[PDB]
Ligand binder design. Structure first.
Ligand SMILES: N=C(N)NOCC[C@H](N)C(=O)O
Ligand SMILES: N=C(N)NOCC[C@H](N)C(=O)O
Ligand SMILES: N=C(N)NOCC[C@H](N)C(=O)O
Ligand SMILES: N=C(N)NOCC[C@H](N)C(=O)O
Ligand SMILES: N=C(N)NOCC[C@H](N)C(=O)O
Ligand SMILES: N=C(N)NOCC[C@H](N)C(=O)O
Lengths: 154, 149, 154, 154, 149, 149
DNA sequence: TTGCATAACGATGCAA
DNA sequence: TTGCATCGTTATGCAA
DNA sequence: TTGCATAACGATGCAA
DNA sequence: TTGCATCGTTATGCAA
DNA sequence: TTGCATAACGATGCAA
DNA sequence: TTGCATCGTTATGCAA
């Protein structure tokens, strides 16, 4: 199935050097498993696979971090956001496509900045006031779902 | 902090926020390093005479109490490790730098500490001007911030 | 009916010391009137009844203010908001779940703060720019309804 | 048809001095063309016709600018906005009734101010954070349509 | 104010706001204490040469006029009772405190008064720095604010 | 600028914005006067070792590079024509005025230039306070700004 | 004095 | 509008 | 000069 | 697109 | 070194 | 969930 294909992908990547998704499709094909690039795109996105390279390092090869870090540049953005939510998030709420977050006075800009830097797929953008942040959910995510996601980190 | 200090913080918290529940109050307290349970907050609010106030057709209510602050500078010192990138000075001004967006948060904590050598603060986005009370200089203020770290 | 039940409630409260809604249900029952706690919750909310107590005052008893004040702490939040709307609100408008309020330059924060402090049931939160405030309506209230409510006070 | 009626209107205005739409209806009637005030309102709005007058100049007469300026006061609110969008707009996006615009750090207020001053018919209002602007679309315009309009100027 | 002063305010108002109607203009004027009816505003705007301007497919239009201010300091003094919590100073700075969020509003009114002894202002959320023009000191500025109350 | 300078700007740009595409990077660069095509940016980002980073279920990614600035003051000088309405001073402060809303944008560019004679800046809405490093005076700073125009 | 576990209490979406 | 069922919110007996 | 009351004027949701 | 009906917005005769 | 044109590559709305 | 078809995004051979 899917989770089996993905296990094979984490394996094929750590052992080989895949530079493209079509390339990973052929690597899976010779191994019996047949998938399209479309699906691998989805898998790698779920896997958190990142096309890596060093300075002057040309086209990268895919690699999934083992909760080990992306060298130097943390990913990291999300963990930092989670820490600041735990510290600064006072309440969450929602209406339509909006999650509304409250913070202590003056803290909204700092928390919103942390959320922007996490670059969440379901967030179109944020605006901070002084103690309130409007977070715009990317369709079809609702404000209520976005809010629940923030709540779970509160 | 202890009962009396925590309750002073609570009064401060309730005047600047709109607190709908003891759970919210706990989150506001935890933001300044104070961690207590809902049972304690129930007791604090009773001792304080705090009431969950609402008008006509007014929903569920918010807590208010009828009519410096303890740990004030410790709340401020607490944030310096996180939010103080650097200090500097010129004449009667200390100039503090913070991560992007953090200036108002740290400046608010400086204000609440109500230091007698500080006339006031203004925050931009990543910079705070702290105005020294004569004859204290900006340099001394900066030194105070560096020492509270 | 309802308004009759409520008249009795304003009466039962000023004469007795009701510490719970179930208690007010029994006080109404012995008086013939049968209601559930659910309805009393709604009535007290409409009535603006507040569970009052002094310092170290234990569990409160319900009391409805007679446009007399809630001692020291004004309610009060609403009147102040209404005054600042009259003074600072330049225009109201709406879209979807949003009321959009305009103020003179620089006044938006101050007006938004007043609205937050009123803690209106139909407002999820506010964000102030410099001369514009976005007010997020709590479902099912629409932005247009919220805006009309602010208009009425303009 | 319509574009023919409008060509006649640009003509009737530059040659005569029309002080009201009902007046422009009679001027078109004597010329065969029959329309209501409602339609002329729509035409003049599309035409960009403006009721002009000088200081102490009483009731104005309609005039459509020939990309020549409205004397002194630029109409140019729009041109200025277009210039600043070209300079400052980093990306556009949308959700529901919202267009979300991103700018370099610190530029959001300045760009949002420019958009306000353009007073676009399909914009209810704007709020600026530091690098993000929420633009509220006036129903029935969607956020996506608003965003595309800004994209076109990016 | 009278005709000439009110019309000066109107010009100032029309350049910083986007005014779609005379009703809006009345609300903007009422915010700075000036109360007149729509009839008077119709007449003011005519005397001013103000036009309701719009481009192509441009909607209903906003008022603009082609090409200190009267009562400027009175508009500022007007707000002090409301918005001035306290004044203080240090060197060339006066430090004003306001209710939460009110700093930009009061600072804007200070700016419009264009006092010759004031180089400029910066507002945070509840604090304004007013920069004194040499050799005026912050203390004298603070005294001026206290006296205008 | 040339390869090395442009790439320095890119590093600065990538740390303060969340850049999802080379197209976005081009818009950010164009905002500070640098115009290059996507092909060049592809090459810049490769030379920089920049990676399009994302976590688990993390969407499409944003560019980051592992681990003052060239043309810094020219970026600042660039904006003065647009954004500097006037300069003035008092003691250790230069006071800059900008069009409404522009203060943060110009102050950010001043900060990035990192002038040794400038301790820091605070922006309001239309005013910037630039704090002079002793013994430089606010007047000299103002003169520097007027000369960079 | 506090936390814990639980009881008492108040609010609310849904169907009628 | 209400009641029902249920859930979020607040109070409190007991151990430490 | 201003407010009041009202008339003149322009804009707009709805059906066709 | 247009017209109808209507409403929000702006101009103006008269009393003071 | 860069731009241009184009190829290679990755993401995604829709139907199944 | 997947594949298809397609589109937005990124890489690269060649002229200058
Ligand atoms: N500005 C202060 N002190 N409070 O007002 C905040 C208003 C609004 N919730 C906002 O966050 O924009
Ligand atoms: N606004 C952004 N992102 N940066 O600019 C900050 C300018 C200035 N140091 C201040 O803190 O006001
Ligand atoms: N910042 C100035 N001066 N005006 O711009 C305001 C932009 C936007 N309406 C806002 O209120 O955020
Ligand atoms: N304040 C800084 N430096 N960044 O935070 C931005 C938060 C949010 N996108 C906003 O524009 O309000
Ligand atoms: N932002 C809030 N809520 N308070 O902080 C204000 C800090 C400082 N006095 C200033 O007015 O900038
Ligand atoms: N906020 C507006 N619209 N004006 O007020 C500006 C006040 C002050 N000069 C500052 O720039 O902070």
């Amino acid at each position: 199935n899917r989770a089996g294909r993905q296990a094979r992908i984490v394996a094929i990547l750590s052992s080989a050097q895949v530079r493209s998704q079509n390339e990973l499709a052929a690597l899976l094909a010779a191994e019996g498993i047949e998938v399209t690039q479309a699906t691998l795109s989805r898998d790698l996105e779920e896997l958190g696979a990142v096309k890596l390279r060093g300075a002057d390092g040309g086209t990268g090869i895919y690699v999934v971090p083992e909760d080990g870090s992306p060298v130097r540049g943390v990913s990291g953005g999300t963990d930092r956001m989670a820490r600041l939510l735990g510290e600064l998030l006072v309440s969450t709420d929602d209406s339509g496509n909006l999650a509304v977050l409250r913070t202590p006075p003056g803290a909204a800009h700092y928390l919103a900045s942390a959320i922007d830097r996490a670059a969440l797929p379901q967030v179109v953008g944020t605006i901070a006031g002084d103690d309130t942040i409007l977070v715009v959910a990317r369709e079809p995510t609702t404000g209520a779902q976005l809010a629940g996601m923030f709540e779970n980190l509160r």
